[PDB]
Amino acid sequence: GANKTVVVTTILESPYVMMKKNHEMLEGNERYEGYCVDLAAEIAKHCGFKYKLTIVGDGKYGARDADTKIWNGMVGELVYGKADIAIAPLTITYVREEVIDFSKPFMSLGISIMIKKGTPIESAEDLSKQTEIAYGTLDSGSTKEFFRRSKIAVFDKMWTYMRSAEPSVFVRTTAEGVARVRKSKGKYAYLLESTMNEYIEQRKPCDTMKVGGNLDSKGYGIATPKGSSLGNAVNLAVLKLSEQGVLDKLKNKWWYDKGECGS
Amino acid sequence: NKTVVVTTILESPYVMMKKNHEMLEGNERYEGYCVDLAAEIAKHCGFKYKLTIVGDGKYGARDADTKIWNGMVGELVYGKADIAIAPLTITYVREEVIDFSKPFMSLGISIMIKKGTPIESAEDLSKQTEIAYGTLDSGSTKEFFRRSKIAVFDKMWTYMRSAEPSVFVRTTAEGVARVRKSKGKYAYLLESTMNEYIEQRKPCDTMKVGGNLDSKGYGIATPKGSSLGNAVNLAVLKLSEQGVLDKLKNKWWYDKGECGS
Ligand SMILES: N[C@@H](CCC(=O)O)C(=O)O
Ligand SMILES: N[C@@H](CCC(=O)O)C(=O)O
Ligand code: NA
Ligand code: NA
Ligand code: NA
């Protein structure tokens, strides 16, 4: 085919993709900064393409509606032919792998627990065995599906509580989870990926922290539509950037170099 | 149908000989994390299989002169095996010539010392000469050093590649033995998974020090273009999501720890 600008679907999720301070003065890809913005640039340079960052319209990662079977989110953008690639903290999962292609992971993570400092909770088991502290997850992403599908007793118990809790314990964006932890005087804990958690505990006012081990072990991948010829080069580029140390540099740059909570 | 030929490697606790194996036959000779994994993948994908220990006992590297692949990788490239189920690192050079599932385990390169050795990091190794150190032959750790442009790692490579006698070993067990027997004068660079397993084994004289040097994964490998790959990769993601991989890990690493809780 002719030369074409690659349409990249991504999500406003700190520190992956953020609005730059002076974004009102800026246009196109220059509006944004963060780990995935830098990662996009690196993949584009290796794979020899021009591209356009496009924030996903509905703000979601991607789930399939059980009634209509329509995919939302970034996954929907690839499934339905709107975008050419997803460069974002998109978890490689079974149900997504059936419908899109994924690179090998560019980051490793697991589900984890965020508390307001001081909350008397150290583990999933501790959340599951009490009722005073509410807890939930992001909508339309892999963490909620983790709970919904777990056969492990403690996780199952947690899903059973979460799915029926009133008011709703689920949040639309990670920022909304963070505010609910910060504002709830220790009466809400948030289940989110260790990568997001670790970032948030580096930001003022330093009132949150990760507790416990991770609940699972998995990875974020760069996604393309099933069968897209871009996949092979993009997967090699990931592995090369991993091997060169560039992914490690990017993680330190966006998580720790400008940390607001010490060390 | 047809029996799937699985290449693997004798590497504790992934594949080990059972007690009394000399009277056993076939797949029943072996036990460990990758034996259990192979069984799970075969069940999910609907195939019979035969485990076969790689003839040359290597993971796989390409000879710079001949461009021939050895090890498990060579098995798959030259058509001797249909799948590899082993702690085989997903790497750029390998990805060019075989297919890989998404990772079934996460790991990084790490440092093993005999307890009390005055080393706490790679940097520490690189700044002295009393304590020798090396890696496995024919694997991803050795390639990591050979190819690194990071100063500390490049410096390590320069030393290792020229050190006399050789600091490289043929098997992980040999590297561990060398650590154990060298009175603190040998440290070994190996994957955090293996390091963690050995520090749970008697005589409890080794330990992992410092952070991991990198972050990567093991995958199930198949020859490039094999029709097994799709189903295998989905099976790894299912076993992951069902918590089976975590259960296998706990069974083979920690259940049997001999060096405390
Ligand atoms: N990374 C997740 C979103 C965050 C979460 O669900 O905790 C996904 O790809 O769905
Ligand atoms: N997992 C490695 C072998 C161990 C090592 O090199 O430390 C490989 O696939 O080459
Ligand atoms: Na796919
Ligand atoms: Na073999
Ligand atoms: Na180390």
Ligand code: NA
């Ligand atoms: Na499950």
Ligand code: NA
């Ligand atoms: Na688990």
